[PDB]
Amino acid sequence: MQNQQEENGSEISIEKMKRYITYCRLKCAPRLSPQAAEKLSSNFVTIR
Amino acid sequence: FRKISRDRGIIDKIISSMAPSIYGHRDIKTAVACSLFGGVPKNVNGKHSIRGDINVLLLGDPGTAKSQILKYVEKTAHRAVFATGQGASAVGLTAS
Ligand SMILES: Nc1ncnc2c1ncn2[C@@H]1O[C@H](COP(=O)(O)OP(=O)(O)OP(O)(O)=S)[C@@H](O)[C@H]1O
Ligand SMILES: [Mg+2]
């Protein structure tokens, strides 16, 4: 079943997953958008 | 080996073959036979590993002949390594 789901593409093999994690950590480093800050601040104030 | 395996009550004979000098501890001998033969390890898709050997703990009062069972397994098994916690002149359990 896992080999079939890897063939369809629903699951990624462990070495491809390893190299993809390495690629994402080396290339991308996202920033929060200004419109994504008010929601986070409001939700953190409500919890406290 | 194939001739002796086709007997219906082969397993019990192996249970009766474990430690002849030890008497009456049939369930302990069954655990010894299971540990000596062992299961099969497996690794599904390389991601998830299932262990394939039986670990047996003999908890007993003094005079239940556990050490003689250990010596019998040391004699019988292929790669059997004897160690102890309190003793000194033995191979250690820690890599060094
Ligand atoms: N069921 C038994 N059948 C045959 N001999 C036995 C049995 N129970 C005890 N003995 C004998 O009694 C003695 C006990 O020796 P041990 O194997 O050292 O006992 P033990 O179970 O290891 O307990 P310890 O030393 O306190 S950890 C030996 O001489 C055994 O042969
Ligand atoms: Mg003992």
Q: How far is B52 from chain A (nearest CA, A)?
A: 21
Amino acid, res. B66: K
The C-alpha atoms of residue B74 and residue B83 are separated, in whole angstroms, by: 11
CA distance A38 to A32: 11
Instruction: Tell me whether residues A3 and B45 touch, CB distance under 8 A.
Output: yes
Torsion sign (Cα): B18, B19, B21, B22: negative
Pocket test for ligand 1, best of B64, B69, B71 (most atoms within 8 A of CB): B64
Pairwise CB contact (< 8 Å): A14 & B46: yes
Ligand 2 centroid to Cα of residue B61, in Å, is: 10
Which residue has its alpha carbon closest to ligand 1 atom 4? B22
Residue B27, Cβ density class (10 Å: 0-12 exposed, 13-18 middle, ≥19 buried): exposed
The verdict on a CB contact (< 8 Å) between A2 and B44 is yes
Cα–Cα distance, A48 to B13 (Å, whole number) = 69
Partnered with residue B44 across adjacent β-strands are B48
CB B36 within 8 A of CB B77: yes
What string of H, E and C letters represents the secondary structure of B32-93? HHHHHHCCCCEEECCCEEECCCCCCCCCCCCCCCHHHHHHHHHHHCCCCCCCCCCCCCCCCC
* Cα–Cα dist B27/B16, whole Å: 11
